[PDB]
């Protein structure tokens, strides 16, 4: 098994800009074969041996977002910086 | 005496974007000759008879801001959206 990865429970929600229902991140990461443990608001995710592409929290975010679907991500224009 | 005006004690601080010291609003409004009473967090201000221009809380904001000096107002760029 690859080394474990610590990631905030709401990190996929913050990156996607979507308040996913509770347990959405943990269920998806378990669906792809990873061991998910809880420690307050921080998850510890050990990806399966056939997923060495999962090395960082960003890799885990891609798993939750692609399984939940990118079509649920809303179109929100960022604020205009004073250019 | 013109009719009394009710205004939050922090309204000049919000309009100016400046955290004025404690009691600055009530001090400046009594200086120009108004009667100031405290009802929790809301002030009740009765302008003097020689100040009929003081009819709304915005007029009271100008009195506090101009006596403290507009130079203390910082320069912050607004959050303009994508045009
Ligand atoms: Mg990936
Ligand atoms: Mg005025």
UniProtKB/Swiss-Prot annotation, chains A, B:
- Renumbered to this chain, the signal peptide range is none
Query: Which residues are noted in the entry as Mg(2+)-binding?
Result: 53, 59, 62-63
Q: Which cysteines are joined by disulfide bonds?
A: none
Q: Which domain of life is it from?
A: Bacteria
Pinpoint the B5 domain residues. 1-75
Subcellular location, in the record's words?
Answer: Cytoplasm
Residues annotated as transmembrane? none
The similarity comment for this entry is: Belongs to the phenylalanyl-tRNA synthetase beta subunit family. Type 1 subfamily.
Q: Could you share any additional remarks the record makes about this protein?
A: Was identified as a high-confidence drug target.
Oligomeric state and interaction partners are given as: Tetramer of two alpha and two beta subunits.
Instruction: Report what the protein is called.
Output: Phenylalanine--tRNA ligase beta subunit
Q: Which organism is the protein's source? A: Mycobacterium tuberculosis (strain ATCC 25618 / H37Rv)
> Entire protein: which part is shown?
415 to 497 of 831
């Amino acid at each position: 098994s690859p080394p474990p990865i610590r990631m905030g429970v709401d990190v996929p929600d913050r990156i996607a800009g979507v308040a996913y229902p509770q347990g959405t991140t943990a269920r998806r990461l378990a669906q792809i074969g990873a061991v998910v443990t809880h420690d307050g608001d921080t998850l510890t995710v050990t990806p399966p041996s056939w997923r060495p592409d999962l090395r960082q929290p960003a890799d885990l975010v891609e798993e939750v977002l692609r399984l939940e679907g990118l079509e649920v991500i809303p179109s929100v224009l960022p604020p205009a910086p004073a250019g």
